Each structure stands twice: as structure tokens, then as C-alpha cells.
RNA sequence: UUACCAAUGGAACUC
């Protein structure tokens, strides 16, 4: 029911290809044993042994088997299990009929999938499809490209449909015990612990196998030589073991091995790296190469598609393999028709202006006034001795711009820190804030990508002494050329933080609150995870309540985010003097698995929280954002596939089933093709319209003040992330509550 | 920081 007749029209070419079904039925049977046979591979074998009887084709569980013929008799078939060597009865009786195109059908489509994927010579590395032999060397970097594919079968609205995206994983080419060899020969005193360190944390292949280990421990102490125990039942040197297997030389005698998580133990000899190298991410040249060379364009997308293919119609095994359960592929991708919604109205205060095919207000912000600026008169700049120059010009030009945008900005108060230590920057913050009490922003000038000085600044800031930060590098400022666009980003950043309001765009729903959520697990789990909230508490959403709650084991996260509506609800009662009549959910941060648990434990929960203001029954319209969907769509102009416009909105054939979702790409997409954005809708007591629902998904892609353009997520999301990404990452620890009401994470 | 895009299970084990 989600379809919609608003936008205009559009053609668009998926990287989705159909399946056809061509059997009438998979039927499914349930096996019983009659001496409970209690292994797994054992009652696997017992039915291979009357495979034949049953026919070639079948998929098994243990207890549940698909076939494509039907074996409607219910039947018992006499085996033998050779231990206990007594008849054992295979009772296998019909429980159910179902469609080809059926959801539990869908794992062994894809099980029959990776057979063909295998037949195809490619390498399963990790759940996706690699091929080594089509490897991209680098000479430069000693890295490898390997090409591949991740593909499923899947059943969409539409059907069954091959998702297939092309994808390059980077290999490293040198061994990790030449890496060791490299840390042994810097000789440096305590750098085994640097080697640890480097170790930790990412992955490592092993390309005898072509299988990933995650790193878990490096074992000093033990050796090659050293005992494992063995199925075989003696225990065993891995020298041993090793060499019987593959007969390589294990080059030395001394190299340590890696414990993954019995144990199992690897060679650094035969195990490489995985992943880019940091130093490498930091690089602007090999980033830019490596993209360069794995970045497709929507053609090249399209064209690999169409290679891979046809390399499974050329092969007469694959298409063997597939047609056995009734499953062929279509020649060429789906082409669906989606509509571009219409284009918005930014309205600032003295004019409003329609964005043109670019969706970027970047230039038309600086020149008009905001709609709420808040005057700046009493403010302090912490500059280092060596960058006053440069300081001195940010504040001059920073004058200049200041008049357009709507503010009246005085001079600032210098404060000169004598060098670049940590305890005098904090110091001296501290003692001119206790100085004054009406410093409203706190300006500072750091040197290098001094990561440790921020995080100092923005706890001290944050937490210890409440009052909007602002960090600048010198870097940025440094530039000649750059400094009037950088200074009108700066002023519009310290306009948020001092509680002004920079833009707004018509809203068509009446007394709303759009709720949005998001979740920041840390790099490494140990750590506690955060769950930011940023709530509007004015009409024209242009005001926002945020507030944090961190992960704690022993509460469940629904307990406090109770109260956090409820402080919101409050907050938006005396600030409008009514509730909100429509409260809309946007809450991102939730994996494919858990949106039956969203659904049913967490927005159930959610809603008690009503009971508290008396007679309180607001319409509540919950969506589940996600972002890391594999689906590329393209606009299939006349002349070649060209990268999709924005604002396009796909509402059929690649929807699920169970629940009103669409599909929406609102970013401009310089570089390769759109990825869309995907919108679940668990809960609409509104009973709001499809295109009432698309249209206020749309709207708040265009309110993001840190960016003048649309954005990926809604407003309310990516604002919550930004809470809980400094809440959890560089604070550690729950930002003051008087700060809240303003926009300080920005 | 001027700012958005930019880890474990797989057939009819691995130590
Ligand atoms: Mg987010
Ligand atoms: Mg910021």
C-alpha cells in the first residue's frame, strides 16, 4: 500500500536480477528416527544412503527436508548406523506445501547459490565471493586487490531477485613474519609490545585456505615445536602437523604463533594482513589510488553484473545446479519505474529560496541573514604564542562576514597560552572562566592533529566548566585563500552552539515531535556503549532536546529512554503549552535481525511512558533507518545508466513484505552511484498517508545545520549520533544537563 | 577538530 503518486516519473535500473521459478511446488517433510539417533553427520549419512529412493535433490537440516519432487507417501525407509549396527527406521512424513518463491526457501536458494558461486572457481572469504586469481597487484604499497562479489537470493515484494554487488577486499602482500622480521631488526627496547599492539585487532588470511582469523593473542613462550593435542589422540608439533599436511619449510624455528579464539595456533609465515594500513587511510595519495581503483562507476557496476552472468549461463554445471530446484536468471538487470519528489523551500527570515538541481544552500546562507542570531559580546580565543598571526586573522575576517549572516559580534577576549602543554591549556581555560561568568564561547586554537589536546578541551568544556567549545586548527585557518568560506562555517557552527537557529524548511504536519535515536557501539565492545536522543521541542523543529543514556548491563536501555521522552515531553509542554498531538520516531542503529525486537519489545515499552501525563494519548509513527543497505539503484537515462538524481523514492519490487518501507536516495552523489537509504515503518497509529510519510522523510534530510545541503538520515538521527559519538568516544562520560538545550556536539 | 558523503559458521571445520 506504500505506493504513491507524488514527483515526477522516473525509469531506474537496480543491481537486482530476477529469478524465475519454474517448478509448481517445494514441498517440506519432517523425519523421525526410531533409535534416537542423536549425531547430526550420522543421520546426514543415513539419508544418503537412500538419497536415491528419496531423489538426487535434496536440502537438508537434521530434522526438517525440502525436495522438489514429491514424496507424498509417507514413508520408512530401513538404514543402519554402523556403531550401534541395528535397523534404524527414517520415518519421513509431508507437513506442508509451499510456493517456490517461500521465505524458508530462501536459505537453501542461497546454499544452492554458493554451490554455483563454488563452481564458478570463486573463493568464499568471508560470507562473500572472492576470486585470487583476478588479484589487482600493487607494486608500491605491497598490497592486493582482490575482486569479487557478494551476492543472495533474496524475495522481495516483486519476487525472487539476485542481489549482486560488486566488491574489492584488500589483502597486504608481505607476511606477517616479515613483519615480525621488521620489528626483530629495528631492535628497539619493549617493541614486542608494539608488535602486539599491531596485531591486535585486525584481521589476518590465511591464503593456504583462503580463511579469515581474527588476531586474539601472540604466544612468546610457545613455539612450533610445542604440543597440541590431536583427534588422532597424541599430541602433536605444529612442525609436525604442518609438514604432513602441506610440507612447507617453516622458515624459522623462532617465529611466534598467533592464538585465535581448544586454542588454534597459526604461523605468522604462512598468515598476511587484512585491511589498509592506517598510516595508508591517513595518506591522501594511496587512499585516492586505491579509490581510484576500486571505485566503480554505474556502468562499470552494471557491466560486472552482466560478466558475471553470463559466466553463470556459460557454465552448463551452474545452470544445472540451479535448475534442479526450478531457478533460472534472467539475461539483464530489473528496470523499475520510481518518482523524484519535488524540490523544497529553505525559508530564512528575510527570504525564502528554492534549491536548483544542486541541493546545496552552501552560497545562499552566508549572504542573508539566519532566522534566529544570538548576539555575541562576551567571548574568550585561547591562542598559542607561535600562531598569532594567524589567530589574528581569523577574528578580522571573521568581522567582515559577520554583518550578512545577522550577527553583532565584538572583539574577543585573548588569552595567550604560554606553550603547548595539556595542564596549562586546561589551566588557563579553567581561570579565565572562573574569572568571568560570561564567557559564552570558548574558542581554541590547537596545533597538529593534537587529538590529546581536544579531548582534554571538550571535557573540561563538556563536563567540569559548562560552556560551549569551539576547537580550530591551525591547519584550516593557515590556508590564504580558504579563510572567508572556513570562517562563515565557524560562525554558523558557534551560532548553533550559542543557541541561534541558522535555517528551516515548511512543515506540513501540525503540533509534531520528531523523536530520533541512535546508537554508538564503541570499536572495541568492552566498552560501554552510548544511545544518543535529540527530540524537537519547538513547532517549526528548529529546537532540540538531547540527551544521552549509556549502556549499563545491569539496566536495559528501554528504562531510560523512558525518561528521556518523558523530560522531552515536559520540556515541549512549557515551552508550546501543549503535547505533542504527533510524535514521529525516527530511530537508526538497529541490525537487520532486530527489527522484530524493535518492533515488539522496545516501541511497546516506549509507549507506557504516555501514562504518566493524564489522559495523554499521542499518534505515534515509528521508522527504523538503515543505512548499510547493499542495494544500488541508477537512473536509466536514454543514452547509459547516470547516477540517480535526488530525492528519488522506490516504493515496489524490492520492499519487503512483512512491513511499508521505501527507499530513499536525498544525497548528491559526486562520486561513484546512489546508495539508497531504508526506511521501516513498525508502528503507524497516525494512520499517516504513504506519501505524508515520504514527504516528512524527505523534509528533514534538509535541516542538518552542520552540512548546507541534504543529508543521508533524517535531522533528528545523525544529530543523535553526533551526541553519542562525543558522549561515548572523546568524553566518556554524560555531557552536563544545562548545556542539553543548545546544539553543543556539533 | 570548519563539515556531510567518505566482526564469525558455509556444501550434497580450523590448532
Ligand atoms: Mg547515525
Ligand atoms: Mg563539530
Same mark, same amino acid.
Request: proline share 5%; with cysteine; aromatic share 8%.
Given at each position: ?193 608494539? !608488535? ?27 613455539? +612450533? ?42 604461523? +605468522? ?42 559466466? $553463470? ?108 602543554? $595539556? ?20 574558542? !581554541?586554537?590547537?596545533? =597538529? ?27 584550516? %585557518? ?20 550559542? =543557541? ?7 512543515? +506540513? ?22 544511545? =544518543? ?75 507506557? !511512558? ?18 548499510? %543497505? ?77 552540512? +548546507? ?30 548545556? !542539553? ?6
Amino acid at each position: 500500500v506504500k505506493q504513491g503518486s507524488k514527483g515526477t516519473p522516473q525509469s531506474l535500473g537496480l543491481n537486482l536480477v530476477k529469478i524465475q521459478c519454474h517448478n509448481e511446488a517445494v514441498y517440506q517433510y519432517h523425519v523421525t528416527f526410531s533409535p534416537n539417533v542423536e549425531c547430526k553427520s550420522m543421520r546426514f549419512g543415513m539419508l544418503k544412503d537412500h538419497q536415491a529412493v528419496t531423489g538426487n535433490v535434496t536440502a537438508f537440516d537434521g530434522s526438517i527436508l525440502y525436495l522438489p519432487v514429491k514424496l507424498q507417501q509417507v514413508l520408512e525407509l530401513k538404514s543402519q548406523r554402523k556403531t550401534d549396527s541395528a535397523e534404524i527406521s527414517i520415518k519421513i512424513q509431508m507437513t506442508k506445501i509451499l510456493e517456490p518463491c517461500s521465505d524458508l526457501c530462501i536459505p537453501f536458494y542461497n546454499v544452492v547459490f554458493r554451490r554455483v558461486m563454488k563452481l564458478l572457481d570463486m573463493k568464499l572469504v568471508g560470507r562473500n565471493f572472492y576470486d585470487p586469481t583476478s588479484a589487482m597487484v600493487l607494486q608500491q604499497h605491497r598490497l592486493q586487490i582482490w575482486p569479487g562479489y557478494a551476492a543472495s537470493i533474496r524475495r522481495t515484494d516483486g519476487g525472487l531477485f539476485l542481489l549482486a554487488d560488486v566488491s574489492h577486499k584488500v589483502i597486504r602482500n608481505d607476511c606477517v613474519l616479515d613483519v615480525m622480521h621488521a620489528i626483530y631488526q629495528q631492535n628497539k627496547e619493549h617493541f614486542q609490545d608494539e !608488535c602486539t599492539k599491531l596485531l591486535v585487532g585486525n584481521i589476518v588470511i590465511t591464503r593456504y585456505n583462503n580463511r579469515t582469523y581474527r588476531i586474539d593473542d601472540v604466544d612468546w613462550n610457545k613455539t +612450533p615445536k610445542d604440543s597440541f593435542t590431536m583427534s588422532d589422540g597424541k599430541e602433536i608439533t605444529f612442525l609436525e602437523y604442518y609438514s604432513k599436511n602441506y610440507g612447507i619449510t617453516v622458515k624459522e624455528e623462532d617465529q611466534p604463533l598467533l592464538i585465535h579464539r581448544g586454542e588454534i595456533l597459526l604461523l +605468522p609465515e604462512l598468515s598476511f594482513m587484512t585491511g589498509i594500513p592506517e598510516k595508508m587511510k591517513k595518506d591522501f595519495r594511496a587512499m585516492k589510488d586505491l579509490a581510484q581503483q576500486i571505485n566503480l562507476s554505474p556502468k562499470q557496476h552494471h557491466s560486472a553484473l552482466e560478466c558475471l552472468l553470463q559466466r $553463470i549461463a556459460k557454465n552448463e554445471a551452474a545452470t544445472n545446479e540451479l535448475m534442479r530446484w526450478g531457478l533460472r536468471l534472467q539475461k539483464d538487470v530489473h528496470k523499475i519505474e520510481g518518482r523524484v519528489l519535488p524540490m523544497e523551500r529553505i525559508n530564512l527570515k528575510n527570504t525564502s529560496f528554492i534549491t536548483s538541481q544542486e541541493l546545496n544552500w552552501v552560497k545562499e546562507v552566508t549572504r542573508d541573514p539566519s532566522i534566529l542570531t544570538i548576539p555575541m559580546h562576551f567571548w574568550a580565543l585561547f591562542y598559542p604564542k607561535r600562531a598569532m598571526d594567524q589567530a589574528r586573522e581569523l577574528v578580522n575576517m571573521l568581522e567582515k562576514i559577520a554583518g550578512p549572516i545577522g550577527m553583532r559580534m565584538s572583539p574577543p577576549a585573548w588569552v595567550e597560552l604560554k606553550d603547548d602543554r $595539556i595542564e596549562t591549556y586546561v589551566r588557563t581555560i579553567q581561570s579565565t572562566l572562573g574569572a568571568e561568568g560570561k564567557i559564552q564561547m570558548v574558542v !581554541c586554537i590547537i596545533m =597538529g592533529p593534537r587529538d590529546d589536546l581536544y579531548g582534554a578541551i571538550k571535557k573540561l568544556c563538556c563536563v567540569q566548566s559548562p560552556v560551549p567549545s569551539q576547537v580550530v586548527n591551525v591547519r584550516t %585557518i593557515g590556508q590564504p585563500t580558504r579563510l572567508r568560506s572556513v570562517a562563515q562555517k565557524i560562525l554558523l557552527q558557534i551560532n548553533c552552539k550559542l =543557541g541561534g537557529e541558522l535555517w528551516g524548511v515548511d512543515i +506540513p504536519l501540525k503540533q509534531l515531535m520528531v523523536i530520533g535515536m541512535d546508537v554508538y557501539h564503541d570499536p572495541s565492545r568492552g566498552m560501554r556503549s552510548v544511545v =544518543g536522543f535529540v527530540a524537537s521541542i519547538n513547532l517549526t523543529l528548529t529546537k532540540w532536546y538531547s540527551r544521552v543514556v549509556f549502556q549499563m548491563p545491569h539496566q536495559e536501555i528501554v528504562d531510560s529512554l523512558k525518561l528521556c521522552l518523558v523530560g522531552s515531553l515536559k520540556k515541549f509542554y512549557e515551552v508550546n503549552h501543549c503535547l505533542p498531538e504527533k510524535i514521529v520516531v525516527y530511530r537508526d542503529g538497529v541490525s537487520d535481525g532486530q527489527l522484530k525486537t524493535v518492533a515488539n519489545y522496545e516501541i511497546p515499552q516506549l509507549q507506557k !511512558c504516555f501514562e504518566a501525563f493524564e489522559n495523554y494519548q499521542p499518534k505515534m509513527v515509528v521508522f527504523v533507518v538503515q543505512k548499510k %543497505i547493499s542495494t544500488n539503484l541508477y537512473l536509466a537515462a536514454p543514452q547509459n545508466f547516470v547516477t540517480p538524481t535526488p530525492g528519488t523514492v522506490v516504493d515496489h519490487t524490492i520492499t519487503s513484505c512483512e512491513w511499508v518501507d521505501f527507499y530513499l536516495l536525498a544525497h548528491h552523489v559526486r562520486q561513484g552511484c546512489g546508495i539508497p537509504t531504508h526506511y521501516v515503518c513498525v508502528l503507524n497509529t497516525a494512520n499517516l498517508s504513504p506519501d505524508h510519510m515520504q514527504r516528512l522523510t524527505f523534509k528533514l534530510c534538509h535541516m542538518y545545520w552542520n552540512w +548546507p545541503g541534504t543529508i543521508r538520515v533524517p535531522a533528528p538521527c545523525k544529530y543523535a549520533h553526533k551526541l553519542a559519538f562525543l558522549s561515548g568516544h572523546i568524553l566518556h562520560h554524560e555531557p552536563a544537563i544545562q548545556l !542539553c538545550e543548545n546544539l553543543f556536539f556539533l
